[PDB]
Design an enzyme around this catalytic site. Structure first.
Site, PDB file in Angstrom:
ATOM      1  N   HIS A  40       0.817  -1.221   0.000  1.00 21.72           N
ATOM      2  CA  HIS A  40       0.000   0.000   0.000  1.00 21.72           C
ATOM      3  C   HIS A  40       0.856   1.279   0.000  1.00 21.72           C
ATOM      4  O   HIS A  40       0.335   2.388  -0.065  1.00 21.72           O
ATOM      5  CB  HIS A  40      -1.012   0.010   1.150  1.00 21.72           C
ATOM      6  N   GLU A  52      19.926   6.333   7.484  1.00 19.21           N
ATOM      7  CA  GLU A  52      19.243   7.398   8.202  1.00 19.21           C
ATOM      8  C   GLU A  52      19.079   7.134   9.697  1.00 19.21           C
ATOM      9  O   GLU A  52      18.883   5.998  10.121  1.00 19.21           O
ATOM     10  CB  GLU A  52      17.845   7.626   7.615  1.00 19.21           C
ATOM     11  N   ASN A  54      18.551  10.518  11.997  1.00 22.54           N
ATOM     12  CA  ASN A  54      17.769  11.751  12.135  1.00 22.54           C
ATOM     13  C   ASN A  54      17.393  12.067  10.680  1.00 22.54           C
ATOM     14  O   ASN A  54      18.284  12.284   9.849  1.00 22.54           O
ATOM     15  CB  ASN A  54      18.642  12.870  12.739  1.00 22.54           C
ATOM     16  N   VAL A  57      18.132  15.984   9.333  1.00 22.51           N
ATOM     17  CA  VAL A  57      19.488  16.522   9.282  1.00 22.51           C
ATOM     18  C   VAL A  57      20.444  15.603   8.510  1.00 22.51           C
ATOM     19  O   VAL A  57      20.460  14.388   8.743  1.00 22.51           O
ATOM     20  CB  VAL A  57      20.040  16.695  10.723  1.00 22.51           C
ATOM     21  N   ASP A  84       0.022  -7.719   1.781  1.00 21.39           N
ATOM     22  CA  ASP A  84       0.532  -6.359   1.795  1.00 21.39           C
ATOM     23  C   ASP A  84       2.058  -6.348   1.815  1.00 21.39           C
ATOM     24  O   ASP A  84       2.680  -5.964   2.807  1.00 21.39           O
ATOM     25  CB  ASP A  84      -0.036  -5.618   3.015  1.00 21.39           C
ATOM     26  N   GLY A 175       3.016   6.539   9.344  1.00 19.23           N
ATOM     27  CA  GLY A 175       4.371   6.930   9.008  1.00 19.23           C
ATOM     28  C   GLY A 175       5.337   5.768   9.206  1.00 19.23           C
ATOM     29  O   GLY A 175       6.506   5.890   8.840  1.00 19.23           O
ATOM     30  N   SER A 177       4.367   2.546   8.233  1.00 16.42           N
ATOM     31  CA  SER A 177       4.020   1.543   7.225  1.00 16.42           C
ATOM     32  C   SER A 177       5.216   1.025   6.447  1.00 16.42           C
ATOM     33  O   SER A 177       6.094   1.800   6.070  1.00 16.42           O
ATOM     34  CB  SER A 177       2.997   2.096   6.238  1.00 16.42           C
ATOM     35  N   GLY A 178       5.233  -0.281   6.200  1.00 19.13           N
ATOM     36  CA  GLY A 178       6.321  -0.884   5.456  1.00 19.13           C
ATOM     37  C   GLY A 178       7.601  -1.173   6.231  1.00 19.13           C
ATOM     38  O   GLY A 178       8.473  -1.869   5.718  1.00 19.13           O
TER      39      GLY A 178
HETATM   40 CA   LIG Z   1      19.723  12.408   8.106  1.00 17.32          CA
END
Ligand SMILES: [Ca+2]
Lengths: 223, 46
Positions: A40, A52, A54, A57, A84, A175, A177-178
């Site tokens: 989805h 990643e 943060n 930044v 899904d 936020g 999801s996945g």
């Molecule tokens: Ca970053």
């Protein structure tokens, strides 16, 4: 992630962020050039962000790679969210080192009670809203099938598992999801859906990865 | 609240009055008609 804690830097090196202007879903790196996420979360144009911690930044460990291939499970049902799962092939391989690593697929399904680690940059509140800069982590147990089915009568398919707490308080949220659900160093779930977030007797529902190991393997080998 | 069974994706949408929702499923859940896609400024006061 509601009721979690800020993950230690590079403690979740396989976590990726799916970006199309801004973060919208998470994902997991399964090998140098393939990412697993929720169907989805499908978009025709996707930029994968690795390394990643943060997300607001530039810390110097990031790799921004565009998705080349975007394949949703053939039987994905948009209404029920069954099957899904989605596979993304990066246009260039990711460079593995300390902040970027792969997560392992499961040999078999996790038993109930198994403790797992969930993570993401999603909402940290169940009533209001607050989105974190730093990746959030949460330890939660895989629930039994009977508990999952009594929590969501007539909505749980054979490709879904509940992970979390019946007492509410801790859960994945919008936020996330996945994103990955890792148990014993193996990817067992993908953040999918639920009745709100961290609600009593409504644990999060996750795509059961162990049912897709063969599909994932066939797809990678054929593309 | 008016919480429903919705996917956990973050894809904000704008609605009525001035409130923006996490995603469309959440919007339709409450009732608020999707005025446009994306969050929204003076069409809400937070
Ligand atoms: Ca970053």
């Amino acid at each position: 992630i509601v009721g979690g804690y800020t993950c230690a830097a590079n403690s979740i090196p396989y976590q990726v962020s799916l970006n199309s202007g801004s973060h919208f879903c998470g994902g997991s790196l399964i090998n140098s050039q393939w990412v697993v996420s929720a169907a989805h979360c499908y978009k025709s144009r996707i930029q994968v962000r690795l390394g990643e911690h943060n997300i607001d930044v530039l810390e110097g460990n990031e790799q921004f790679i565009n998705a080349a291939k975007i394949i949703t499970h053939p039987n994905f049902n948009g209404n029920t969210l069954d099957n899904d799962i989605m596979l993304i092939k990066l246009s260039s391989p990711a460079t593995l080192n300390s902040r970027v690593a792969t997560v392992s697929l499961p040999r078999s399904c996790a038993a109930a009670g198994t403790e797992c680690l969930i993570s993401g940059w999603g909402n940290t509140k169940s009533s209001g809203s607050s989105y974190p800069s730093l990746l959030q982590c949460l330890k939660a147990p895989v629930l039994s099938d009977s508990s999952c089915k009594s929590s969501y009568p007539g909505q749980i398919t054979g490709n879904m598992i509940c992970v979390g707490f019946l007492e509410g308080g801790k859960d994945s949220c919008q936020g996330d999801s996945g994103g990955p659900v890792v148990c014993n160093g193996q990817l067992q779930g993908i953040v999918s859906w639920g009745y709100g977030c961290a609600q009593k007797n409504k644990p999060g529902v996750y795509t059961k990865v162990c049912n897709y190991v063969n599909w994932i393997q066939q797809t990678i080998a054929a593309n | 609240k008016k919480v429903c069974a919705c996917p956990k994706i973050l894809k904000p949408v704008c609605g009525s009055d001035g409130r923006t929702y996490a995603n469309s499923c959440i919007a339709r859940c409450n009732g608020v008609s999707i005025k446009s896609e994306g969050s929204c400024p003076t069409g809400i006061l937070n």
